Symmetry: C2
């Protein structure tokens, strides 16, 4: 609709084309950078890249930089590419870990080329992003390495808990680490290199981590009560991963919670069990307690973004937060 | 023995001791840095610290940081190749490798953006070597030229970086940094050609199980040379190279292609020693000399 850029309606086509141009420049950079790789990477490298992505983080970086005097600064496009490359790397690695066959509506990188070619593809994304971020200076470099480290402890935290745990507190530490910090960094990078005041930078950075925690939580609710609008439904069920709505549903009481407690104990290979467990979780009070927490996070973000200056980028960010909790995929 | 550090005999028990401290500082930094998330023979550490012997400040903290970053990237690639195509272990391969890259990312961030560009490139080269390898195997194709490119990328490139970073951060001159970098490039190439040669002559008590490259069908230099031969037992080895596999080895070790592979390891040795001769006449150049020899003559 030309007022929508990357799933988000921005109200105006003049403004949306400016943001679209910025998101388009983040993508030209990745397309340039990846395409320059040795012949032997090009299949796996562009696989997830060719097939569409939500483009959420390039948007968030671009929308954050709109809080600045030079939102179109070239260093913002660079920082916009670093963020999305790291995120792409983790999709290659996640899809091998979750043994996922399908990603972004296409064959997942590993279902196409096998686990090792997938792992390496992600590695090469990490190198490329490392090289890109060094262009932005010592502090940008420190930011992205702190964020990448904190991302991985999130992934490790999640894995440690599944192998043993069911702890809301720990889950909230996971989603903040494995998703929030990267968008936290993207907000901090777009504030920085668009020229926003130190305060706005901190405010945009705070905002990205909250938006990132929210976005992951909506992704875990979508995994349970969506039906093939995500990108395969109920993956958390099958992998025995216990996200927020399952965790609450297990703290529940009654015959339903009883069944779930035995179903969600470890992985599920039976298809007709996932259908039953998806029905149970979809109906549980646990799922509505988790929609609440989601809305609570949305409110922390809209509060954070309500103390940003009244500029079009503050409205645009507000629609992004709303999109983040209201979308269905 | 007292004069041996990380497998290389440096002739001098006193120099080997100073080198060991450098290697153990690296080992200790890998310990303090890897310890907590919510709480995994040291050739590349050793190569870093010997490079830095050419510089004025061999013991610089930056040198120790670079040694750790190198070996962490090294290990991360080891974990990642233990991913096979059971999920519990695969997950531990990927994350352990990813936690090592994250921690290297943090450490190199302290070494600064030029040290970030260097490490980023060599990992990209490193990963490229692995793809070439992994994908040269799937096609069953057998070029010496893809294999030589493989080892320069997969193995030679990270030791190149070890010499360059040991060079810069010991305070070596610009010419010396690039010379160390060219050095580690050939040393890592040859080190890998020796690894592949070893896989066919070694035994388990004297190493890993032999012929694991044969089992996976990874065709290394002695193989690629041996497949080009024309003898009575060639076709037998042509077919065998897709526990009977113990018969491919015994064909491989008495092959003239194997001795060809050893000639080339030597030609890489000569190249590395010429790089060495162009360095200052200091004890560290001697130590590097002993490393080059150990690189091409172990088992
Ligand atoms: Mg659009
Ligand atoms: Mg996506
Ligand atoms: Mg709790």
């Amino acid at each position: 609709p030309a007022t929508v850029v990357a799933g988000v309606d921005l109200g105006d086509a003049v403004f949306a084309a400016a943001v679209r141009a910025g998101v388009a420049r983040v993508e030209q950079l990745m397309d340039t950078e990846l395409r320059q790789a040795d012949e032997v990477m090009s299949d796996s490298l562009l696989h997830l890249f060719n097939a569409g992505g939500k483009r959420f983080r390039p948007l968030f970086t671009v929308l954050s930089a709109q809080i600045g005097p030079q939102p179109d600064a070239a260093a913002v496009t660079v920082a916009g590419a670093v963020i999305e490359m790291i995120h792409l790397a983790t999709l290659y690695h996640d899809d091998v870990m979750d043994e996922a066959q399908v990603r972004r509506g296409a064959p997942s990188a590993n279902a196409q080329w096998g686990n090792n070619v997938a792992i390496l593809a992600g590695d090469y994304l990490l190198a490329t992003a490392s090289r890109l971020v060094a262009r932005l200076g010592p502090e940008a470099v420190r930011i992205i390495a702190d964020t990448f480290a904190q991302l991985v402890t999130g992934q490790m935290r999640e894995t440690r808990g599944t192998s043993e745990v069911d702890s809301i507190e720990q889950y909230l530490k996971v989603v903040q680490e494995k998703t929030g910090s990267l968008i936290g960094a993207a907000g901090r990078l777009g504030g920085m290199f668009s020229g926003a005041t130190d305060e706005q930078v901190e405010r945009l950075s705070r905002l990205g981590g909250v938006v990132g925690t929210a976005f992951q939580i909506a992704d875990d609710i979508i995994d349970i009560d969506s039906e093939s609008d995500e990108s395969l439904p109920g993956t958390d069920v099958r992998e025995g991963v216990h996200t927020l709505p399952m965790l609450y549903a297990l703290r529940e009481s009654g015959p339903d919670c009883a069944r779930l407690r035995a179903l969600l104990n470890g992985p599920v290979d039976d298809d007709a069990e996932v259908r039953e467990a998806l029905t149970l979780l979809r109906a549980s009070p646990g799922m509505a307690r988790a929609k609440d927490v989601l809305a609570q996070y949305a409110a922390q973000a809209r509060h954070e973004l309500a103390l940003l200056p009244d500029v079009p980028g503050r409205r645009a960010l507000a629609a992004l937060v709303d999109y983040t909790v209201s979308r269905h995929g």
